[PDB]
């Protein structure tokens, strides 16, 4: 992926981090039953105004070095090839060939 | 579909527009680049220019449309036939 796409991604996570507390509490009011009907509806409208990016579903997992949006792995981060590269040269602490 | 516990979802920009429209009896088409909203009882009889990707299709909200979203009434693909 291009450098620009990586720049857009870090902006998405940064914006979500700043409004993380507001989103957590606002959704709690929505989810919680027994809350006033008018209160719940206002909470919905507030989330709309609230910048889209701030939603944690707006982030795409990308390689921390190249930004590839596909083939990502939570564990070891990196990406498909990137894992190998580090593991291959001897930078990953413990990985090796599996012959079970 | 959307959960019943969350009620209907409407865009505030469109929502603001209809409020002004109903209090003034406006008949001009409502310009909107959004389709995620749902049909409300207070939009009955209005004409909304719903974006389809390149143009805004005017749709006249009727009584039977209540409860549905704006998206179901704006086809996005132009398909005539394969021959």
């Amino acid at each position: 992926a291009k450098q620009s796409m990586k720049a857009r991604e870090v902006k998405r996570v940064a914006l979500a981090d700043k409004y993380f507390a507001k989103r957590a509490e606002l959704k709690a009011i929505i989810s919680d039953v027994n809350a006033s009907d008018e209160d719940r509806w206002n909470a919905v409208l507030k989330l709309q105004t609230l910048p889209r990016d701030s939603s944690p579903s707006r982030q795409r997992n990308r390689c921390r070095q190249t930004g590839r949006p596909h083939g990502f792995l939570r564990k070891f981060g990196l990406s498909r090839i990137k894992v190998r590269e580090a593991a291959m040269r001897g930078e990953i602490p413990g990985l090796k060939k599996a012959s079970w | 579909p959307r959960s019943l516990k969350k009620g209907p979802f409407i865009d505030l920009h469109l929502l603001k527009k209809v409020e002004k429209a109903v209090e003034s009896g406006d008949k001009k088409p409502l310009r909107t680049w959004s389709r995620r909203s749902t049909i409300f009882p207070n939009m009955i009889g209005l004409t909304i220019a719903v974006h389809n990707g390149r143009q805004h299709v005017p749709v006249f909200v009727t009584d039977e449309m209540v409860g549905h979203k704006l998206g179901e009434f704006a086809p996005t693909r132009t398909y005539r036939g394969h021959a």
Partner: peptide
């Protein structure tokens, strides 16, 4: 009918 009647009862109408 019902399109509005359904909407009425199903949603709290805030």
């Amino acid at each position: 009918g019902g399109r509005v009647d359904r909407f009425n009862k199903r949603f709290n109408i805030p």
